[PDB]
Design a protein around this ligand. Structure first.
Ligand SMILES: Cc1cc2nc3c(=O)[nH]c(=O)nc-3n(C[C@H](O)[C@H](O)[C@H](O)COP(=O)(O)O)c2cc1C
Ligand SMILES: Cc1cc2nc3c(=O)[nH]c(=O)nc-3n(C[C@H](O)[C@H](O)[C@H](O)COP(=O)(O)O)c2cc1C
Ligand SMILES: Cc1cc2nc3c(=O)[nH]c(=O)nc-3n(C[C@H](O)[C@H](O)[C@H](O)COP(=O)(O)O)c2cc1C
Ligand SMILES: Cc1cc2nc3c(=O)[nH]c(=O)nc-3n(C[C@H](O)[C@H](O)[C@H](O)COP(=O)(O)O)c2cc1C
Ligand SMILES: Cc1cc2nc3c(=O)[nH]c(=O)nc-3n(C[C@H](O)[C@H](O)[C@H](O)COP(=O)(O)O)c2cc1C
Ligand SMILES: Cc1cc2nc3c(=O)[nH]c(=O)nc-3n(C[C@H](O)[C@H](O)[C@H](O)COP(=O)(O)O)c2cc1C
Lengths: 307, 307, 305, 305, 305, 305
C-alpha cells in the first residue's frame, strides 16, 4: 500500500503534445540519467546463478540505458569469491549508472571497497531498524562518516516503512545526496510506517530542491508517474523485472523495460508534461489516508492541486 | 474499542538507541514506579481461592517490580473474615506499590480503613453511574472528603465510559492525584461514552502536567505505548494477567509480565524514545472517530504530529 | 465447531411430562452417575493455586452430585508436594465419582498409582499423537486397562475419533471413549467433528459407552451430544470461569442452573430419562450429514425413530 | 420463515381456464366454506376497543363470505362485560362460519361454554407447551373433542407440528390441525417450518384436514400452503392492520383483493378448484427438501404428479 | 438466468479435429438450415424505421446464410403500409429461411395470411397466458398447425416450458417448441430455466425439435443449449444492437464471428457435427440438477454418455 | 483450484508408527524413485541463465535424490548452443532420474533425439490442443511411445483429464499421464480439477500410473494427490522461487523440508508406505463430490476403505 492510489492527476483536455516531444531524462543528484526508472537487483542465493542473473540485468540495463542497483555487497566484501558476481555488472555495463549497496552497519572503509568493487556512480545505504530488531545506535554516525569519505553520491534507502521529513532532514544534513523511499512481535508493526506517497509529499515540503527516489510497490507506469509528480526524481523497480528475466531472459526483460518507459511517455503526453520537471509540477489531488496524514503533519495538500 | 487504533506513531528511521538504554520508569503522582504497567486484580468470588489468586499476584508483582491494585475491599470492610484475602497482598509484597480499592459510595472512614488494610500507597475510587443505574448525588462530595482525610494519593477511576476534561477537572480540583481512564434499557448505552484515546487527549489538553492512567482494553505493548504517548503516566492490565495465572501459575504470570515489559522497550527503541517522558512526546497522528471527536471538542490534534 | 449445530431436534407438540418426572441419571460404563454432566478440572500451574482450585472444584462437585475429573497427575507422580493437590479432591469429596488423569505415554504402574492417589472411580487416558509430532501407544493403553480395575476412558483431544479408532480402544479394554473433536498449517481442517464421531462410533457400537467433552456451549449442546449417543458430557472452561468469577457458590449455581436447563429441554422433548433422550428424533444436516453419508453411517434412523 | 420459499410451482404454458371458472371453495373437516382464507381475530386488550374491533372483523367477514376465528375466550368465560365482545361476532355475522378459541388448558365445560357463547361452527384449541415452561394436555384435548359437537381444530403456535403429533391429535378426535410453524436461546432454531409440517403430516394422513396460518405474506403463500396439502389458510396481522388503517371498507377490500389474486395464481396454474390446486406439480428445494428427505417423506411425488 | 451456467462440458484432451472439418448445419423440424443460429427480429415501432431495420436484418441474414424470424405481423395483417415492412424481408432474402410471427390469439386464417405475406418457411406462435392476465389457446394452436402447411414453432416467452406443455403442443401438431425461460410480485421466482426445460422436454421426447432463444450470451451458451438438446438457437438483442452500432456490415460480422466461435468450441470438444454436439458429455449442477432430479429427469446420462 | 480442498483425510487416533519407519519411495510406471516428488524445470528464456538454472536444479536434484524434469527441448533440437543447457543436467546428475520434454506436436525422431540428449529415464509429452486454437495428435503420441524405449508420460496442462482421454493415451502406449488441471472467455470455467481427474481416471484404471503436478501448495496437497491415486507429484514454481531466493543450498533445503513434512503427515495417518497412503480413508465433498457422483465414480469407497 504505497498510498499512490490516493493521488489523482487533474485531467488535461488540451495537452498540446506529441509523444515524440516527451523528454523523460532526469537527475539523481548531480548524476544524469536518461531514464526515471532504474532496476533494483536482488541479492539472491549467491553462487553462479546470482552471477548470471546480474550479468543479464547489467546487459539489459546497458541496452535500455537505465540505471541499475546491485544487491547488498556486504557478503562479497568478506568473501573474495562472491565478489565476481558484482564486478561482472560493471564489465557488462561500462557506460551505465550503477549503484553500490551496503547496510547502515557498513563502515567508511567497506563503503569505499563496495563502490570500488563495481565502479559505482553512487552508493546506496539501506536502513531497517524494525526488521533488524525482530530478527541500533550509531546508524546516523556511520552514514555521516561514509558520506564524507566516498568519492560518489550516497543514497540512503528506507526499506518498507517510509520516511519522515525529520528523518530526511538528518540524512540530507549528514551528507546524503538523496533518499530512497520504500514505504511473535511482528504484529506490532502491522499498521506501522508512512506510505510512499505521504513520505514524498512530506519530505518535499521541507526540502523542495532535494533529490528524492521512490522504489517498491510501483506496480506500473502510472505509479511511477504519481511518485515523480509527488517529487521523486527517479523511481526503482525490482520484482517486476526479476520475473520477466526468469521468463524470457535478457530479450524479455529488455522488452518489459522499453514497454514501461514508453507507457510513461504516454501518460506524460496525456498530461501535457513535456519533461520530468514538468511532471513534477503536474496538478493533482491527494485524498484519503494520505491527505489526512499530510494535513495533520502540517503539509499543504491544495498546493498540489492549484499549481 | 479504546480508540487507540486511531493512533499511529510517526516512524523514526534513525532511532539512535540501544534497547539497553531504554528507561521505562514512571511517576504516578509523587509515587515512583519502575514499570509503566501495573496489575488490576479482580475481586473474584471470595473465599480461599481469592486469597490464593491475590497471594500469587502479589508474589509475581513483587518479583517483576510492578504495581498492583486489589479488587474492591468494600465487602472485606464489613466482613472481618474476608479481610485476610487482601492483607496477604502486603505480606507477600512488602516493598511494592499497591493500590487500595473502594467504590464512590465509600466514606472517608472506610477509605482510611481500606488503605490501612493493605498498607496502600494510593487509593482507587471507581465511579460507575451508568452501571449502578441499570442494575447518584454526593459522589463528588464523598471523593472530596476522602481525598483530604487519607494519608495517600487518590486515583479516581472510571470503568468503561471514559472521562471528559470537565469530569477530570472536577476530580483534580477536588483533590484526586490522578484519574484512571477505562473508556432492558442497557441499549441506551450501546454507543455511549468517550474512548480511552479521546479521553486522554481531552484531559491532557486542559491539564498538561496532571497524572493520567489508562486501563482496560490494552491488548498489548503497542496499546500501552499509544496510551502513554497520549499522556498516560501508567497503564493497567487485568484479564491478560489473570488468565496467564490460572494457566501457568506464578511462574507463568511473571513471564508474561517481563515479556510485555520487554516488548514495550522494543517499541520505544524503534521510536527513539529513551524514557517514558520521551514516549509522551512521540510524534503521532490521530485519525478516524477519535480525530473527529477531538476536533469538535476543541482539542488540537496536529500538535501530536508536529511535535 | 462441534458440528452439533447440524443437529436439530424434531419438535414434540404434546410431550406429556412434568419437570419433576425427568430423570437425568446415566451410566458411564459400569459406573453409575446421577448426572450426565461432569467437571473437567485443569492441571493449571501447580502450586497452592491448583490445590485450592481443585479443592473448590471438589467441594462444589461434591455438593452438586456431579462427577469430577482431575487434570494430569504425571507431575504428582514424581512430586510429593503437588500430590496433595489431588489427594484433597477425595478428602473433600469422599462419596462422589472422581476420574484420575494421565497421558497416553503413562505406564500401567503410573496409571495404577494415579488411581490410588485419589481413590479414582475411573481413569482417563488422553491421546494426541498429533501434538507429539508413537508406536506402542495402543498396547500401552491395553496394559493400563488390564492393570487398573476401574473403567478406563480414553479421551481424544480436538481432532475427533473414527469408528475404527474407537473399536481399537474398545478391544484394548477401554470402558469408554471421550470424544473431544510451520507444519501446524497442515491440521487446520483436520479431524472429525464431535457430532460426526458420536454418530459414526455409535453406528458400529450401539451399546458401547461414549462421552462428549469440549465445545459444549450450553444445556442444548449437552442434549444433542446425548441424543447423538453420548452417555455423559464433560465441561471445563465454563466451570473454571464460574469459579474464578463467583467462587464455589457460583460454580455450584452454574452446575445446577445447567442441569435444570437440561431437564427443561428434555421436558419439551418428552424425554423422561437419559435413555429416552438417546432415542429422540432429530435431523442431521450440513457437513455432518455429508460426512456420515459418505462414511456409510445411516442418518435417517435419527429422524424416523 | 415458513419454508414456503422452498416451494416453486411447475409452470403451465396452457392453463386452459378463465378467471370466471375458478372455484375457491373448500372444506374444513365436515364444514363447508366458500373461502380457503379466514380472519384470525386477536384477543387484544379487552375493553370496548376489542368489542369494536371484533364487531368490525365480524361485519367485514360477513360481507366477504370468509370465516372468522375469535381470540381467546378464557376471559369472557369469567367476565360478563367482556363476553359481549364475542357475542357481538355472531350478532353481526348470523350466517357465517365462526371459530371459538381457547387454550389447551381449557376444560371440556369451558370448551362447550365458549362454543355456545358465539354459536361457533368449529372450535380452536391452541398449543404451546414450550411457553408454559404439561401432562394431560392430550387427554384434555380428547375430552374437549368428545364434549363439543362441532369440529375441533388444534392449533400449534410457531414451532410447527410433526406427523407423530398430528396423528395423536387426530386419534384424540381433532377434526383438523392448524400449523403455525436466558433459556429462550435454546429455541432459536427449534421447530419445523410450516411447509415441512404440511408435507410431513400429509404423507401420513392424505385425507385428514390441515390448516396453515401465520407468516403467509400474500396470495402466493396461500397458494403454496394449499398446494402442499392445506385445506384452508389463516391470516391475522395483515387484516388487523388493514382494519386500523382503513376500517371495515378497507378490510373488506383487502379480503377481496387477496381472494381474487389467489384465483389469478390458480388460473395461471390451470387449477380450477381447490382440490386441483392440491395436486399442482411443484418442486421442493433447500432446507425443506432435506428435512423431508431425512424424515422419509417423498418429495418427487409433488413434482411428478 | 438461463441455467446454462449449471452446465459444464467434460473436457476433451484429444479432440482429433480441424476447424475445417466442423459442420454446424442443423435441422429444424423438417426444415434444413446451414446454421444453428438465427436472427430474431423485433417488431419495434412500425413506421419506416422498422421497414429499414427489417430490410437490413434480411440482407445481413441473407448474406450470412442464417435464418431470420420477423416480429409480430398482427399489425400488418390489418395495415397495408406496415405490410410492406415484412414483404421486404422476402424481397431482399429470396432464398433464405424466414419465420413468420403471430400471437397465440391469432386465428388459423391470420396464421395462413401471415405466412403468405413473407413466403415463410415456418411460423412462430408465441405464448404467455401469464401476461394476458385463456381457454381455447391450445385448440387454436392446433387449428393453426393444421391450416398452415409449413412447420409451426410454438415459442414460450421467459417462463420456460415443462415436458407436459411441450407434449401437448406436439400432439397439437407443433413442429417444434421454442424455449425462452402489484400482482407481478407473484411471478418473481416463477418458471423453469431454459436449461431445465430443454433437459426435461428432451427426456420425454428424444427426437422432437426444440429451440432455445433468449438470454444466450455468446457462442458457448449456444453450444450448451444444443448440447442439452436444442436443434437451433435464437438471438435478438445482440444482433439488434450490432445493427444500430455498425449497420449491416457490422451485423454480418457479428453473425460470422459467433458462428466461427461456435465451431471453435466444437473443435475443442471433438464434436464434428451438430448431432455430435448433442451427445457431448457434460455435467449438470446446482439448481438445474436439483430441479431435474426431483422431476425425475436423469442427469447422469449427460455425463456417462 | 485443484479441488484438493474438497478432500479431507479421516483422522487416525492411533497411527502406530515412527517417522523413521516411513517409506516415501514410489514407482512411476516401470521406473523406481526414492521420492514421490520431483522438480519440474522451466524452459525460461534460453541463454546462459537457463544453462545455470538447469545446472543448479540438476545439482540440487542430484543431492536430494528426487527426479528432475527439464523444460521443452524443441529449441535445443535445432540450436547447438542451447543443447548444452540440457546436456549439463545429465553431466551434473549422472545417477538420478531425469525426464525429457517435448510438445505433442513433436515427431518420434525428435522424441528419441530429445531423450538421447540428456540420457532421459522417461519422456514427457505435454498436451493443450486448446491453446493451439489438431488431428493426428493421438497417433503422433502413439508413435512416440513406440519409437522411444523409456516410459512416456503424457502431461495435460491446466484443463484436467477425463477417464476417456486417459484411456486413449494408455492404449496409445503412454506409461503414465500427468494431470495438471476474446474467445478466452469461453474457457473460464472449462475443465476438470486435478482431484476430479485423479479420482475419475483411477476408477477406470486402478493399476495405471498417474501423476499430479501444478497447484500443489505444500506437503498436504502432495499427500492428497497420492491418496487420490497419484504415484508421484510434480512441483515447479515453488522450487524455482526457492532457487532464485537462496540458490542451490536453498532449493536443497526446501526439497528436504517438504519431503520430511510429507513423512510427518503419513505418520499422523498411519501410512508407512506410498502404497498405504494410496488406500488412506478420506472424504470427498463439494464440487468434486458432485462431479464424480454424476460421472458415475464411486466416492464412498474412499471413505469406507
Ligand atoms: C530476495 C530479496 C532480496 C533483496 N535484496 C536487497 C538488497 O540487497 N538491497 C536493498 O537495498 N534492497 C533489497 N531488497 C528490497 C528491494 O530492493 C525493494 O525495496 C522491494 O522490496 C522490492 O521491489 P519491488 O516492490 O519493485 O518488487 C530485496 C528483496 C527481496 C525479495
Ligand atoms: C470479575 C471482575 C471483577 C472486577 N473487579 C473490579 C474491582 O473490584 N475494582 C475495579 O476498579 N475494577 C474491577 N474490574 C474492572 C477491571 O479492573 C478493568 O476496568 C477492566 O474491566 C478489565 O481489564 P482488562 O481490559 O485489562 O482485562 C473487574 C472486572 C471483572 C471481569
Ligand atoms: C488450562 C487448561 C488445562 C487442561 N488440562 C487438561 C489435562 O491435564 N488433561 C486433559 O485430559 N484435559 C485437559 N484440558 C482439556 C479440557 O479438560 C477440555 O477437554 C477442553 O479442551 C477445554 O474445556 P471445554 O470442555 O470447556 O471446551 C485442559 C484445558 C485448559 C484450558
Ligand atoms: C395481538 C395478538 C393477539 C393474538 N391472540 C391470539 C389468541 O387469542 N388465540 C390464538 O390462537 N392466536 C392468537 N394470535 C396468533 C395469530 O392468530 C396468528 O396465528 C399469528 O401468530 C399472527 O398473525 P399472522 O397469521 O398474520 O402471522 C394473536 C396475535 C397477535 C399479534
Ligand atoms: C423491442 C423488442 C421487440 C420484440 N418483439 C417480438 C415479437 O414480435 N415476437 C416474438 O415472438 N418475440 C419478440 N421479442 C422477443 C425476442 O425475440 C427474444 O425472444 C428475447 O426476449 C429478447 O432477445 P434475446 O434473445 O437477445 O434475449 C422482442 C424483444 C424486444 C427487445
Ligand atoms: C516460466 C515457466 C516455464 C514452463 N515451461 C514448461 C515446459 O517447457 N514444459 C512443460 O511441460 N511445462 C512447463 N511449465 C509448467 C510447469 O512445469 C507446471 O506444470 C505448472 O504449470 C507450474 O508450476 P507449479 O507446478 O509449481 O504450479 C512452465 C511454467 C513456468 C512458470
Amino acid at each position: 500500500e504505497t498510498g499512490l492510489d490516493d493521488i489523482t492527476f487533474v485531467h488535461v483536455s488540451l495537452p498540446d503534445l506529441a509523444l515524440e516531444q516527451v523528454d523523460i531524462s532526469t537527475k539523481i543528484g548531480e548524476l544524469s540519467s536518461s531514464s526515471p526508472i532504474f532496476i533494483n537487483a536482488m541479492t539472491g542465493g549467491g553462487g553462479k546463478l546470482t552471477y548470471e542473473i546480474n550479468k543479464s540485468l547489467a546487459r539489459a540495463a546497458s541496452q535500455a540505458g537505465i540505471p541499475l542497483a546491485v544487491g547488498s555487497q556486504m557478503s562479497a566484501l568478506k568473501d573474495p569469491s562472491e565478489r565476481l558476481s558484482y564486478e561482472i555488472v560493471r564489465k557488462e555495463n561500462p557506460n551505465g549508472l550503477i549503484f553500490a549497496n551496503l547496510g547502515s552497519e557498513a563502515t567508511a572503509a567497506q563503503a569505499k571497497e563496495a563502490v570500488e568493487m563495481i565502479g559505482a556512480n553512487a552508493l546506496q545505504i539501506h536502513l531497517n531498524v524494525i526488521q533488524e530488531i525482530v530478527m541500533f545506535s550509531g546508524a546516523l554516525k556511520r552514514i555521516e562518516q561514509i558520506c564524507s569519505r566516498v568519492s560518489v553520491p550516497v543514497i540512503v534507502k528506507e526499506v518498507g516503512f517510509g520516511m519522515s521529513k525529520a528523518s530526511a532532514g538528518k540524512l540530507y544534513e549528514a551528507g546524503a545526496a538523496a533518499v530512497d523511499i520504500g514505504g511473535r512481535q511482528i504484529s506490532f508493526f502491522n499498521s506501522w510506517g508512512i506510505s510512499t506517497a505521504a513520505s514524498l509529499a512530506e519530505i518535499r515540503s521541507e526540502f523542495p530542491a532535494s533529490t528524492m527516489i521512490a522504489s517498491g510497490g510501483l506496480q506500473d507506469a502510472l505509479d511511477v508517474a504519481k511518485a515523480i509528480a509527488l517529487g521523486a526524481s527517479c523511481t526503482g523497480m525490482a520484482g517486476h523485472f526479476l520475473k520477466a528475466l526468469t521468463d524470457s531472459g535478457e530479450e524479455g526483460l529488455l522488452e518489459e523495460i522499453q514497454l514501461i518507459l514508453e507507457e510513461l511517455k504516454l501518460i506524460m503526453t496525456v498530461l501535457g508534461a513535456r519533461t520530468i520537471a514538468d511532471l513534477q509540477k503536474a496538478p493533482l489531488v491527494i485524498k484519503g489516508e494520505t491527505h489526512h496524514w499530510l494535513t495533520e503533519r502540517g503539509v499543504n495538500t491544495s498546493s498540489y492541486s492549484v499549481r
